[PDB]
Design a protein around this ligand. Structure first.
Ligand SMILES: Cc1cc2nc3c(=O)[nH]c(=O)nc-3n(C[C@H](O)[C@H](O)[C@H](O)COP(=O)(O)OP(=O)(O)OC[C@H]3O[C@@H](n4cnc5c(N)ncnc54)[C@H](O)[C@@H]3O)c2cc1C
Ligand SMILES: O=C(O)c1cc(Oc2ccc(C(F)(F)F)cc2Cl)ccc1[N+](=O)[O-]
Length: 464
């Protein structure tokens, strides 16, 4: 008669519920979602022409053990036939670009100065092994990048990269929290390079991904297919999914059970897995849990406006994954993904070139703090100018989608590890039957969030 309530029906909540429900002697699971739909930021639109437009992740990187674990999840859900891979025999898999100095420049692979870098990067990697080692417990991605790789690398590479992964500022982000490997490598070995030159699930799908060397994958009906298959598996196992039911309050009681307070009803839980945003959870917590709520409230998230653009009979200047825009080149336009290069089967019919412009940065952030009106037009125009200037697409978009995603990518700023440590210390010291999960904590990628929900599920199962 043990009940586990999962807050939030994003990919984290979905995965947590999925792993709970699949245990041999599973508890009653209730998944509680505030909105009308499940899947969180993972969301796909089927446009009029049958094209697919992604409102969240444009596709998934099968990188490392977590990449592999996600492909396993996909196999378990029987989504094999829907999988669209980008195989190592194409440039979408082999071409990242930076827009710097009125031009696209290919980023290096391995193998001579490469514009916009004045010297060949070999010389920077060299002085990298020689670089001492940060003695501070935490350090910003910028400070870390500069110190070990040089100002150009810091300003063109890590600036852009933080924008591509976190839609965020390398001058504010923690190297320790945002790029753990880079940080451990430097900490343990005395150089990023050495620590990496010095060091997994299995299934047919994984094996293929390795064999064909996938740089990423997606689903035919769009990524939302993943959250959708998960939900479908949940209800078919009697898991109880509540949609349209914000959680309004959390409190403990006699027998250390949780009362989960909805709008106009309540649930009793022996355990709660919180897969909602840290700052939301924060506001849900009972006055006794104030120190945990403080730690949670210190975790914030940037917004990102996603603009999907389709042109009929247009073509790109180059072929690649997409291109990133450094902040010194534009504070509002983070980068553009070349959807048709990776996933031409999603171009609809008549087929038309598709790109996705990610807007955000301090442009969007200063605007949110302004009295300015954040209209569809404002975003449409920004994305179009960028498409026109950075890709030479002076044609009018034949289709356009605009979505302003409020507070959608948690930012792991300096001290973030300590907020996590405090939360965990409090949770364990007071034996709260509460488990944190999701993008707010130990990684924002979908792969990370899935894993985060699995770990949550696993640890709650270990307390019957
Ligand atoms: C545009 C953009 C592009 C991205 N691209 C990629 C990429 O390609 N690759 C990649 O790996 N990752 C990508 N991501 C990041 C990744 O998609 C997210 O970090 C991840 O999906 C977040 O999942 P989550 O479960 O942790 O949170 P969420 O998806 O935000 O889910 C949390 C859910 O909890 C719900 N909730 C809130 N309050 C309550 C309440 N009180 N009661 C019940 N429910 C509540 C919310 O409605 C929400 O649905 C991208 C993100 C953005 C937005
Ligand atoms: O590598 C990337 O993540 C990359 C992302 C791009 O677009 C984004 C996708 C998602 C986000 C996100 F998730 F941070 F919002 C930002 C950007 Cl700029 C464009 C280009 C690239 N790239 O490597 O050439």
């Amino acid at each position: 008669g043990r009940t586990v309530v999962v807050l939030g029906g994003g990919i984290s909540g979905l995965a947590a519920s999925y792993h709970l429900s699949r245990a041999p002697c599973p508890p009653k699971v209730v998944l509680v979602e505030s909105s009308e739909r499940l899947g969180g930021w993972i969301r796909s639109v089927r446009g009029p022409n049958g094209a697919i437009f992604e409102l969240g992740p444009q596709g998934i990187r099968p990188a490392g053990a977590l990449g592999a674990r996600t492909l396993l999840l996909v196999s378990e859900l029987g989504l094999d036939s829907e999988v669209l891979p980008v195989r190592g025999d194409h440039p979408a898999a082999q071409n990242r670009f930076l827009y710097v100095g009125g031009a696209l420049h290919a980023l290096p692979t391995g193998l001579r100065p490469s514009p916009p870098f004045s010297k060949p990067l070999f010389w920077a990697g060299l002085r990298e092994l020689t670089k001492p080692r940060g003695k501070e417990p935490d350090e910003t991605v910028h400070s870390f990048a500069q110190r070990r790789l040089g100002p150009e690398v810091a300003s063109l590479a890590m600036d852009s990269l933080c924008r591509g992964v976190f839609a965020g500022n390398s001058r504010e982000l923690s190297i320790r929290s945002c790029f753990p490997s880079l940080f451990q490598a430097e900490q343990t070995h005395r150089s990023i390079l050495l620590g990496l030159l010095l060091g997994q699930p299995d299934s047919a799908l994984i094996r293929q991904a390795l064999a064909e060397r996938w740089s990423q994958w997606s689903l035919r009906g769009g990524l939302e297919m993943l959250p959708q298959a998960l939900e479908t598996h949940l209800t078919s196992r009697g898991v109880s999914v509540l949609r349209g039911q914000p959680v309004c309050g959390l409190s403990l009681q006699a027998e250390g059970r949780w009362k989960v307070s909805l709008r106009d009803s309540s649930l009793e839980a022996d355990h709660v897995i919180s897969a909602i945003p840290a700052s939301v959870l924060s506001e849900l917590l009972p006055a006794e849990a104030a120190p945990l709520a403080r730690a949670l409230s210190a975790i914030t998230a940037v917004s990102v406006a996603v603009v999907n653009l389709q042109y009929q009979g247009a073509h790109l200047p180059v072929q690649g994954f997409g291109h990133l825009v450094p902040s010194s080149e534009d504070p509002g336009v983070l980068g553009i993904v070349y959807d048709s290069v990776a996933f031409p089967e999603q171009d609809g019919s008549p087929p038309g070139l598709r790109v996705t412009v990610m807007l955000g940065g301090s442009w969007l952030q200063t605007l949110e703090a302004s009295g300015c009106v954040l209209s569809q037009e404002l975003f449409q125009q920004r994305a179009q100018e960028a498409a026109a200037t950075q890709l030479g697409l002076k044609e009018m978009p034949s289709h356009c989608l605009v979505h302003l995603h409020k507070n959608c990518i948690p930012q792991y700023t300096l001290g973030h590890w300590q907020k996590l440590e405090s939360a965990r210390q409090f949770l364990t010291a007071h034996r709260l039957p509460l488990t944190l999960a999701g993008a707010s904590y130990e990684g924002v990628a979908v792969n990370d969030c899935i894993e985060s929900g699995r770990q949550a599920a696993v640890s709650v199962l270990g307390t019957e």
